[PDB]
Amino acid sequence: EWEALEKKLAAAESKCQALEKKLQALEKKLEALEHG
Amino acid sequence: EWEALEKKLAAAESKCQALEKKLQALEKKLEALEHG
Amino acid sequence: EWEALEKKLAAAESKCQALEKKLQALEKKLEALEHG
Ligand SMILES: [Pb+2]
Ligand SMILES: [Zn+2]
Ligand SMILES: [Zn+2]
Ligand SMILES: [Zn+2]
């Protein structure tokens, strides 16, 4: 439905935001190794 | 169109799922280095 | 609205594309360490 589409998009946006933060966390660990 | 919007959202969701798995794979390699 | 939904999906797709490229950049640094 249209309402399910709206909720699906919101859930997709929240998943991306979580992935962006996970990537930032991995970057921090990788930079610690790269400059260790 | 509406139908193109539905397909675009499904394709976007599948791309995210693939990125989540790629990030998990990179995390595994980074953890091997971090604890090596 | 419907038009806001279309724009929200486009913005979400562009965020994912940027994350895919960021992940590729982190992979390159991790591979340099993994084979160093
Ligand atoms: Pb994403
Ligand atoms: Zn660095
Ligand atoms: Zn660790
Ligand atoms: Zn490698």
| Ligand at shortest distance from the CA of A32 | 2
Please report the number of interchain residue pairs, chain B to chain C, with beta-carbon separation below 8 angstroms. 31
- List b or e across B2-34, with b for residues whose CB sees 16 or more CB atoms inside 10 angstroms: eeebeeebeebbebbeebeebbeebbeebeeee
List gaps in chain C by the residue before each (C–N > 2.5 Å). none
Q: How far apart are the first and last CA of chain C?
A: 52
Name the experiment that determined this structure.
X-ray
Instruction: Report d(CA B12, CA B33) in Å as an integer.
Output: 32
> Residues with Cβ < 8 Å from A16, sequence gap 6 or more?
B16, C12, C15, C16, C19
Resolution in A: 1.8
Residue C17, token pair as written in the block: 């594309």
Segment 3-32 of chain B within 8 Å of chain C by CB: 5, 8-9, 12, 15-16, 19, 22-23, 26, 29-30, 32
- How many C-beta atoms surround the C-beta of residue A2 within 10 A? 10
Residue C33, token pair as written in the block: 């360490």
Question: Which among A27, A24, C16, A17 is positioned nearest to B18, based on CA atoms?
Answer: C16
| Ligand at shortest distance from the CA of C11 | 1
Instruction: Report d(CA C31, CA C36) in Å as an integer.
Output: 8
